[PDB]
Amino acid sequence: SVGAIVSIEKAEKNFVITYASGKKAQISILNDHLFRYHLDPTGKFEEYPTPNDPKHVAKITAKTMADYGTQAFEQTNVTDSGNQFILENNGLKIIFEKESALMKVLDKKKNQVILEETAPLSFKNDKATQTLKQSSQENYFGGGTQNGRFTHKGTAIQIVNTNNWVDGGVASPNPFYWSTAGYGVVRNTWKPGNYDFGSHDPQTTTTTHEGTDFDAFYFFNDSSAGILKDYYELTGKPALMPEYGFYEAHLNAYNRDYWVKVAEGTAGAVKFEDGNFYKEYQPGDLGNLNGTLESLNGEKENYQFSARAVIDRYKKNDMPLGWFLPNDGYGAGYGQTDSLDGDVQNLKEFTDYAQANGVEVGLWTQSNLHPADPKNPKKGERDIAKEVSVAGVKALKTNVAWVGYGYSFGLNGVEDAANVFVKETDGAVRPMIVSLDGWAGTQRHAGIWTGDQTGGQWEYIRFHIPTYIGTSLSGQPNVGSDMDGIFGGKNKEVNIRDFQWKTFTPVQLNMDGWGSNPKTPFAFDQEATDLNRAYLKLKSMMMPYNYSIAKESVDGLPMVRAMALEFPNEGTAYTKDSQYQYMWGPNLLVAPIYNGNQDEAGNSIRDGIYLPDEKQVWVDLFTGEKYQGGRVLNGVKTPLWKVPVFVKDGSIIPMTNPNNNPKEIQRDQRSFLIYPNGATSFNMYEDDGISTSYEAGQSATTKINSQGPKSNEKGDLTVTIEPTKGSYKDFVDERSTTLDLLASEAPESVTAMVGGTEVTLKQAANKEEFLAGTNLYYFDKEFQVNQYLSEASGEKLNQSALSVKLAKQSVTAKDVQITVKGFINKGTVDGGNTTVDDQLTIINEEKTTLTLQSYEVERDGTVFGNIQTNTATFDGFSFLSEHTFRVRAVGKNGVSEWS
Numbered sequence: 001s002v003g004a005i006v007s008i009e010k011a012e013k014n015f016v017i018t019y020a021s022g023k024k025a026q027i028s029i030l031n032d033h034l035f036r037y038h039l040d041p042t043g044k045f046e047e048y049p050t051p052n053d054p055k056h057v058a059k060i061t062a063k064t065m066a067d068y069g070t071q072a073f074e075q076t077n078v079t080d081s082g083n084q085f086i087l088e089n090n091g092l093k094i095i096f097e098k099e100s101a102l103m104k105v106l107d108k109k110k111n112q113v114i115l116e117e118t119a120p121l122s123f124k125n126d127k128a129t130q131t132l133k134q135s136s137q138e139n140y141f142g143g144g145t146q147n148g149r150f151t152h153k154g155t156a157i158q159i160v161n162t163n164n165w166v167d168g169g170v171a172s173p174n175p176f177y178w179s180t181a182g183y184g185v186v187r188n189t190w191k192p193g194n195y196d197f198g199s200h201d202p203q204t205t206t207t208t209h210e211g212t213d214f215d216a217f218y219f220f221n222d223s224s225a226g227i228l229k230d231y232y233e234l235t236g237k238p239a240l241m242p243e244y245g246f247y248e249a250h251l252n253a254y255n256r257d258y259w260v261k262v263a264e265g266t267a268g269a270v271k272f273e274d275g276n277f278y279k280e281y282q283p284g285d286l287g288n289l290n291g292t293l294e295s296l297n298g299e300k301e302n303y304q305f306s307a308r309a310v311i312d313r314y315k316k317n318d319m320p321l322g323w324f325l326p327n328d329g330y331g332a333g334y335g336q337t338d339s340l341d342g343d344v345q346n347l348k349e350f351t352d353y354a355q356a357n358g359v360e361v362g363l364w365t366q367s368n369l370h371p372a373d374p375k376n377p378k379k380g381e382r383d384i385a386k387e388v389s390v391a392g393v394k395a396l397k398t399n400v401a402w403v404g405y406g407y408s409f410g411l412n413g414v415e416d417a418a419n420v421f422v423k424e425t426d427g428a429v430r431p432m433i434v435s436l437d438g439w440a441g442t443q444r445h446a447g448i449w450t451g452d453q454t455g456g457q458w459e460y461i462r463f464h465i466p467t468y469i470g471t472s473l474s475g476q477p478n479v480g481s482d483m484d485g486i487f488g489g490k491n492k493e494v495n496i497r498d499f500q501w502k503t504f505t506p507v508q509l510n511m512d513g514w515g516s517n518p519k520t521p522f523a524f525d526q527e528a529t530d531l532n533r534a535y536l537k538l539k540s541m542m543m544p545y546n547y548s549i550a551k552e553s554v555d556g557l558p559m560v561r562a563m564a565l566e567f568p569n570e571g572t573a574y575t576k577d578s579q580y581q582y583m584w585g586p587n588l589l590v591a592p593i594y595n596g597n598q599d600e601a602g603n604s605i606r607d608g609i610y611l612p613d614e615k616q617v618w619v620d621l622f623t624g625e626k627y628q629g630g631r632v633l634n635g636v637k638t639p640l641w642k643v644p645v646f647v648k649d650g651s652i653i654p655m656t657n658p659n660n661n662p663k664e665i666q667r668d669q670r671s672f673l674i675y676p677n678g679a680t681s682f683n684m685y686e687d688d689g690i691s692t693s694y695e696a697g698q699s700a701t702t703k704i705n706s707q708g709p710k711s712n713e714k715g716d717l718t719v720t721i722e723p724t725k726g727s728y729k730d731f732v733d734e735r736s737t738t739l740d741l742l743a744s745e746a747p748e749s750v751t752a753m754v755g756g757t758e759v760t761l762k763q764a765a766n767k768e769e770f771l772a773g774t775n776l777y778y779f780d781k782e783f784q785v786n787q788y789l790s791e792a793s794g795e796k797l798n799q800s801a802l803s804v805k806l807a808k809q810s811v812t813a814k815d816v817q818i819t820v821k822g823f824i825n826k827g828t829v830d831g832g833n834t835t836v837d838d839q840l841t842i843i844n845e846e847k848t849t850l851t852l853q854s855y856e857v858e859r860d861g862t863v864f865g866n867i868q869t870n871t872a873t874f875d876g877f878s879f880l881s882e883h884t885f886r887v888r889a890v891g892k893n894g895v896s897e898w899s
């Protein structure tokens with residue numbers, strides 16, 4: 001410990017703190033709510049921490065201290081105020097007790113102490129520990145990909161390159177955490193650490209990293225978006241994936257292995273298009289067997305075993321496919337020639353075939369990406385410059401055998417790789433890198449996948465949902481995983497459920513070749529295949545919404561949003577009551593099926609569906625069924641065909657035609673699925689979908705406003721689409737417009753203004769007239785949000801919608817204003833009467849393992865509904881914990897008093 005503070009002096013560029021021991025710290029003020037504190041026992045105070053190898057030159061920060069400017073520092077004063085030294089600017093008071101040396105930070109906007117040290121920095125055992133106050137309602141997020149977890153109050157997390165891909169591990173650590181008090185901290189170190197959020201004293205948080213340096217950035221902000229924007233300004237804004245990255249990929253090795261003809265029912269046998277069964281062998285495992293060697297292009301009397309054959313299967317099965325890695329396998333390679341250049345030419349011919357099918361090609365790596373002599377490569381070396389420039393590769397996956405060292409290694413590797421994609425293509429290809437073993441800053445170059453786990457079991461879904469939520473809260477919005485796992489399989493229900501929820505997530509990897517069955521969306525029976533296709537096509541139709549929330553994630557909230565990001569005023573949104581559900585952007589609440597519990601009919605039973613906000617109507621995306629917020633629903637029956645997805649009434653959801661890749665999208669059309677509820681808005685983002693030009697302002701945005709009656713009420717609706725702002729390569733100006741307005745009755749009238757000139761709308765007599773015509777409206781009681789799902793489920797899934805179509809116009813030169821008189825979208829709302837009713841009435845010790853004796857129950861101040869009998873069970877409790885309950889009855893004029 002460094003003892004009392006003897007002085008704080010304002011030097012040329014920072015405040016210098018001298019402690020009684022002779023040790024010094026520098027405080028650098030970067031803006032009115034961000035400062036760096038650096039206690040350096042060496043007295044060198046160099047700008048950057050020492051990495052694990054001097055060749056690791058990529059930095060945690062993406063913005064230098066100098067880049068922030070001197071203005072906040074100029075406008076910060078140091079005062080000697082009795083028992084304290086105080087640094088003060090317009091944003092913060094940073095207060096130091098002289099004798100104890102303890103720091104606390106007052107946020108001047110809030111006029112509240114946000115961060116307070118309760119014990120001095122500790123440097124024992126070659127570690128640097130900070131000890132902070134923890135308040136009773138204070139919650140904590142971050143730490144990177146904390147497998148299984150998102151909300152850290154009362155727990156410790158390891159900030160370690162664990163190389164552990166399952167529940168309880170850390171696939172990708174990040175020395176970044178933030179507090180709901182309104183602060184975030186990046187420890188400016190490459191060393192591992194451990195953050196203890198009061199797992200001992202609930203009133204104490206400790207943060208530890210290896211080393212004797214204490215260097216940290218502290219940022220104070222009153223919104224979660226603001227905390228993440230501070231982290232992004234400091235360590236780099238997330239890369240925006242190219243459009244094709246949001247589509248499922250196929251990953252395997254097609255250069256190395258043999259297929260041996262075997263009997264049907266042989267262990268590991270797979271049936272092929274010749275009607276025969278084969279078993280796959282690595283060359284070292286053939287022994288005396290003869291088999292057919294795989295290749296990428298199927299040029300060697302081996303076509304069905306080739307990478308091209310796999311692309312042909314995705315197309316035959318009418319499945320979306322964005323990108324393909326054909327060298328994903330140890331020592332597999334991408335050519336069977338005697339030279340690197342021979343192999344690159346083989347990969348080029350594969351890329352030409354894939355691109356002719358609307359598929360991009362990526363490469364896996366287990367190694368460095370450059371030859372020892374780039375001008376004289378050896379067979380089996382890698383050359384990412386030639387792979388990109390000659391073979392047309394656009395994406396990269398970094399395997400743990402490359403980046404497994406962690407910390408400064410990974411960031412160096414992905415920064416170099418991102419630079420090669422951009423430099424070799426002159427900016428025509430933006431990075432598409434999937435990695436792990438990341439650190440602070442990784443998001444600016446790469447997304448992560450969670451590593452290797454076993455699918456075909458419910459645990460595969462259960463631990464992944466919080467994994468994705470916590471990755472996103474750590475400043476990494478580009479998160480993905482294997483579709484039904486790299487290992488295991490042979491469980492149809494888990495396969496369908498994994499394709500269902502991952503529709504509403506960024507990255508989907510069919511990681512093939514290691515499992516109990518091949519890894520494709522068409523590996524199970526026709527029912528599974530049709531359901532997986534229906535969900536994959538829904539993601540394709542949602543790409544304008546998805547790419548808009550992706551753009552928001554570059555400098556704002558992530559795509560997978562913890563409930564607390566959208567509903568910060570509700571306690572339930574911060575706890576494990578929110579571990580198995582999330583907001584996919586602002587408009588969709590996703591509550592995946594994650595266990596095998598079923599009703600007598602074989603429907604999944606979903607417990608703990610948390611619907612926020614007692615004033616908010618939630619609408620079943622598939623059926624139109626309406627639910628009141630402010631409640632947690634238990635016992636929700638969910639058929640195999642269905643995943644629980646609720647639209648936030650008010651939502652505008654930009655949509656497109658179903659498509660198997662970005663080249664199949666109709667760029668001369670736009671379409672909006674709108675659930676009118678008061679005054680709502682959406683900003684639709686677009687760009688060339690592939691280049692770095694979005695970073696130089698080549699992109700366009702379109703604002704859509706919906707101004708109507710509140711949920712279930714009748715009145716005027718105005719939908720306005722403001723003129724499109726911006727331009728980019730091959731921008732399409734002339735587009736037709738479709739509005740699909742969920743509605744319960746035909747309107748009194750529908751009128752249209754296009755750039756201030758009236759357009760006459762005819763009422764279509766029938767759906768056939770509507771589909772074939774333009775400048776029409778139609779009130780449709782057979783509106784299907786997803787016809788693939790109607791056909792796959794065997795249910796019509798009909799909804800009522802007022803649809804409007806306008807002819808092609810210039811989207812830049814002319815706005816759209818549509819006015820509907822007598823607009824109404826009314827249905828019965830489950831829990832719709834939230835008032836208290838005076839006219840309404842009001843522990844079973846036997847099966848404690850708790851059960852009390854329709855109805856609602858408050859459990860620790862959280863309200864549970866859909867309780868349709870006198871009794872109800874609440875599980876998910878600690879072995880010998882205590883809880884607090886009361887009950888009320890539910891009738892058509894409201895709910896009783898409690899108890």
Ligand SMILES: CC(=O)N[C@H]1[C@@H](OC[C@H](N)C(=O)O)O[C@H](CO)[C@H](O)[C@@H]1O
Binds near residue numbers: 328398400486
């Ligand atoms: C974590 C990771 O890099 N996983 C890779 C790696 O898996 C190898 C497994 N763990 C093994 O036991 O050998 O390499 C395979 C190659 O096909 C996959 O890329 C996987 O994602």
Ligand SMILES: [Ca+2]
Binds near residue numbers: 252253254255513
């Ligand atoms: Ca193979």
